Amino acid sequence: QSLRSSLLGLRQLLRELPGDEAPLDALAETVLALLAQYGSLRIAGLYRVRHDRTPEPQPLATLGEMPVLDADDLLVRTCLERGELVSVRQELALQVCVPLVDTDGRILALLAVEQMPFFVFNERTFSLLAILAGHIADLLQDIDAQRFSQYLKRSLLDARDHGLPACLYAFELTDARYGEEVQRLLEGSQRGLDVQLRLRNDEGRRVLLVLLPLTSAEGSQGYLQRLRILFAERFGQARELESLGVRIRQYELDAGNDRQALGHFLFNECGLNDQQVAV
Ligand SMILES: Nc1nc2c(ncn2[C@@H]2O[C@@H]3COP(=O)(O)O[C@H]4[C@@H](O)[C@H](n5cnc6c(=O)[nH]c(N)nc65)O[C@@H]4COP(=O)(O)O[C@H]3[C@H]2O)c(=O)[nH]1
Ligand SMILES: Nc1nc2c(ncn2[C@@H]2O[C@@H]3COP(=O)(O)O[C@H]4[C@@H](O)[C@H](n5cnc6c(=O)[nH]c(N)nc65)O[C@@H]4COP(=O)(O)O[C@H]3[C@H]2O)c(=O)[nH]1
Ligand code: NA
Ligand code: NA
C-alpha cells in the first residue's frame, strides 16, 4: 500500500521534468532509493541495460560502497537472459539481481545488490522488489490507449506472478442526454494509477473503461460506492446512476483469471476490439 504513494510520487516526478533529459537518467537516484527502502538494501547499484540486454558498466546510481560491476557475473547474466529477479542460493559478490522489465519484456535497467541484511533475504522481499521494479519500468516508458493497455498488461502480470488483484469497470453510456456529463464526472473522479479510456463499442455506444490496478474486491466496492455518492451529488439523490442510461460491467482480475477470460470480457461482452485495447 506504501506502494501506491511511491509510484504516485515517482509518476509526479516524471511528469514535472524537462525533455532535456531521459527519465531513467534523471530519476536514477530516486528509483534506487525506492528500491533500497523496500528491500532495506545496504549496498547496491542501478544500471542502464542496453538494447542487447547487457548492462552499462558505469552505474547510474550507487548505494554504499558498491564494487565495479562484473558484466560476466553469472547472476547478472542469468537475470538479464531470463528477464527475472535472481538471487544466490541462501545456503551460500552479488546477492541478488533485479531487472526492471516493462510489459513488453524490454529490460530498461538492472538493480544489482551487493549486500542486504540476512533477514530480508527472502521471497516476500524478492517479490516486493520485483513488483516495484516492473511498475517502475512501466513509468519510465494513442497516449490514453497506449497507457491503458500497458497498465492492463501490468495488472495481468501482477495477478499471474504475484496474485495481486485488479478491477476493470466498463461504463456503457446509453443515454446521449447524460453521456458527456457522466463521462466528465467519472474523469474528474480519477485516482492516480487508475486509468480510464473513452471508447465506442461495436453497437456505436460510448463506453468509459476504468482500470483499478492493485485493487481488491473490497476496494472496488469502496470505489463504486464512492461513485454513487458523487453521482447523487451531481444529478441529485433522487436519481440512480442507472436511470441516466448507464450500464455497468465489472471484471475482477485475479490469480484464477486468464488473458483469454479477460479478452472475452473486453471483446465478446463489452463489444470492443483489439485495435482499441491490446491484450
Ligand atoms: N474519497 C476518495 N477520493 C479519492 C480516492 N482516490 C482518489 N480520490 C480522488 O481522486 C483525487 C486524486 O487522487 P490521487 O490522484 O490518487 O492523488 C491523491 C493522493 O496522492 C493524495 N492522498 C489523499 N488522501 C490520501 C490517502 O488517504 N492515502 C494516500 N496514499 N494518498 C492520499 O492526495 C492526492 C489528492 O487527494 P484528493 O485531493 O482528495 O483528490 C483525490 C480524490 O478527490 C479515494 O480512495 N477516496
Ligand atoms: N483504485 C481505487 N480505489 C478506490 C478509489 N476510491 C475508493 N477506492 C477504494 O475504496 C476504499 C475506500 O474508499 P473511500 O471510501 O473513499 O475511503 C478512502 C478515503 O476516505 C481516503 N482517501 C484515500 N485517498 C484519497 C484521496 O486521494 N482523496 C480523498 N479525499 N480521500 C482519500 O482514505 C480511505 C481509504 O482509502 P483506501 O485505503 O485506498 O481504500 C479505498 C480504496 O481501496 C479509486 O478512485 N480508485
Ligand atoms: Na454494456
Ligand atoms: Na478483435
Shared domain for 182 and 48, answered yes or no, is no
120 and 15 within one domain:
yes
> In this structure, are 176 and 278 located in the same domain?
yes
Which of 108, 123, 142 is at the close of a domain? 142
Provide the resolution (angstroms). 2.3
Same domain flag for 133 and 147:
no
Selection from 253, 190, 183, 245 nearest residue 223 by Cα: 190
Q: Is 230 in the pocket of ligand 2 (CB under 6 A)?
A: no
Write down which residue in 108, 125, 142 finishes a domain. 142
Instruction: Write down which residue in 117, 142, 167 finishes a domain.
Output: 142
Residue with CA closest to ligand 2 atom 37: 219
Which CATH number do you get for residue 77? 3.30.450.40
Strand 166-173 versus strand 195-200 pairing type: unpaired
Task: Tell me: do 132 and 247 sit in the same domain.
Answer: no
Closest CA to 59 of 19, 95, 32: 32
Tell me how far apart the alpha carbons of residues 154 and 137 are, in angstroms, rounded to a whole number: 10
226 CB near ligand 2 (under 6 Å): yes
123 in Cβ contact with 250 (< 8 Å): no
Rounded (5°) CA angle 221-134-142: 75
Q: Are residues 102 and 201 in the same domain?
A: no
**Structure letter (DSSP) for residue 194:** -
Reduced to 3 states (helix: H, G, I; strand: E, B; else coil), residue 45 is strand
Whether residue 91 sits in one domain with residue 182: no
Residues 173 and 2: their CA atoms lie apart, in Å, by 35
Pairing of strands 43-48, 206-212: unpaired
CB 212 within 8 A of CB 168: yes
Overall number of domains in the chain: 2
Do 41 and 136 belong together in one domain?
Answer: yes
Question: Long-range pairs for 83-89 at CB < 8 Å and ≥24 separation?
Answer: 83/107, 84/130, 85/126, 85/129, 85/130, 85/133, 87/121, 87/126
**In sequence order, what are the beta bridge partners of 4?**
none
Q: Do residues 251 and 136 share a domain?
A: no
**Protein residue closest via CA to atom 36 of ligand 1:** 191
Q: Please name the amino acid found at residue 130.
A: A
Helix (H, G, I), strand (E, B) or coil at 1: coil
| Cα 165-12-54 angle, rounded to 5 deg | 75
**What does the longest C-alpha to C-alpha distance in the chain come to?**
68
Residues 183 and 262 in one domain: yes
> Which residues are within 8 A (CB) of 263 and not within 5 positions of it... i.e. 6 or more apart?
279
Experimental method: X-ray
Is the CB of residue 73 less than 8 Å from the CB of residue 61? no
* 100 vs 121: CA distance, rounded Å: 19
- Give yes or no for residue 138 CB within 6 A of ligand 2: no
Say which CATH number the domain at 231 has.
Answer: 3.30.70.2880
Distance CA 110, CA 104 (A): 16
| H helix or E strand, kind and range, residue 110 | strand 107-115
Which of 226, 228, 233 for a ligand 2 pocket mutation test, highest count of atoms within 8 Å of Cβ?
Answer: 226
Query: Cα of 205 to ligand 3 centre, how many Å?
Result: 9
Q: What is the Cα–Cα distance from 263 to 258, expressed in whole angstroms?
A: 9
Do 116 and 170 belong to one domain?
no
Give CA–CA dist 30/26, Å, rounded.
9
Binding site membership of 8 for ligand 1 (Cβ less than 6 Å): yes
C-alpha cell at 2: 506504501
Q: How far apart are CA 213 and CA 220, in angstroms?
A: 10
Dihedrals phi, psi of 210, to nearest 5 degrees: -125, 120
Single-letter residue type at 157 = L
64 and 46 in contact (C-beta within 8 Å)? no
Strands 107-115 and 43-48 come out as antiparallel
Distance 222 CA to ligand 2 centre (A): 7
The finding on whether 224 has its CB within 6 A of some atom of ligand 2 is no
In this structure, the answer to whether residues 165 and 110 fall within a common structural domain is no
Ligand 1 atom closest to the Cα of residue 8 is 20
Residue 247 host element (H or E): strand 246-253
How many Cα atoms sit within 13 Å of 271 on the Cβ side?
13
Torsion angle, alpha carbons of 257, 261, 266, 271, to 10: -150
* Binding site membership of 5 for ligand 1 (Cβ less than 6 Å): yes
Q: Hey, what's the cell of 120? A: 530480508
Instruction: Point out the ligand nearest to the CA of residue 251.
Output: 3
The backbone torsions φ and ψ at residue 202, rounded to the nearest 5 degrees and listed phi first, read: -65, 0
Cβ pair 147, 104 in contact under 8 A: no
The alpha carbon of residue 146 and the mean position of all alpha carbons in its chain are separated, in whole angstroms, by: 13
State which ligand 2 atom lies nearest to the alpha carbon of 189.
45
CA 41, chain centre distance (Å): 23
- Whole-number Å distance, alpha carbon 231 to ligand 2 midpoint, is 16
Return the CA Rg of the chain.
Answer: 21
Tell me the residue range of the domain where 176 lies.
143-279
